[PDB]
Swiss-Prot record:
<dbReference type="GO" id="GO:0030550">
    <property type="term" value="F:acetylcholine receptor inhibitor activity"/>
</dbReference>
<feature type="site" description="Important for binding to human alpha-7 nAChR">
    <location>
        <position position="10"/>
    </location>
</feature>
<feature type="disulfide bond" description="In Imi-ribbon form; alternate">
    <location>
        <begin position="2"/>
        <end position="12"/>
    </location>
</feature>
<keyword id="KW-0027">Amidation</keyword>
<feature type="disulfide bond" description="In Imi-globular form; alternate">
    <location>
        <begin position="2"/>
        <end position="8"/>
    </location>
</feature>
<keyword id="KW-0629">Postsynaptic neurotoxin</keyword>
<feature type="site" description="Important for binding to human alpha-7 nAChR">
    <location>
        <position position="5"/>
    </location>
</feature>
<protein>
    <recommendedName>
        <fullName>Alpha-conotoxin ImI</fullName>
    </recommendedName>
</protein>
<keyword id="KW-0008">Acetylcholine receptor inhibiting toxin</keyword>
<keyword id="KW-0800">Toxin</keyword>
<keyword id="KW-1015">Disulfide bond</keyword>
<dbReference type="GO" id="GO:0090729">
    <property type="term" value="F:toxin activity"/>
</dbReference>
<dbReference type="GO" id="GO:0099106">
    <property type="term" value="F:ion channel regulator activity"/>
</dbReference>
<feature type="site" description="Important for binding to human alpha-7 nAChR">
    <location>
        <position position="7"/>
    </location>
</feature>
<feature type="modified residue" description="Cysteine amide">
    <location>
        <position position="12"/>
    </location>
</feature>
<dbReference type="GO" id="GO:0035792">
    <property type="term" value="C:host cell postsynaptic membrane"/>
</dbReference>
<dbReference type="GO" id="GO:0005576">
    <property type="term" value="C:extracellular region"/>
</dbReference>
Length: 12
């Protein structure tokens, strides 16, 4: 996904 990467905390 993207929250699966710590650069995407804000939204997934």
């Amino acid at each position: 996904g993207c929250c699966s990467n710590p650069r995407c905390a804000w939204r997934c």
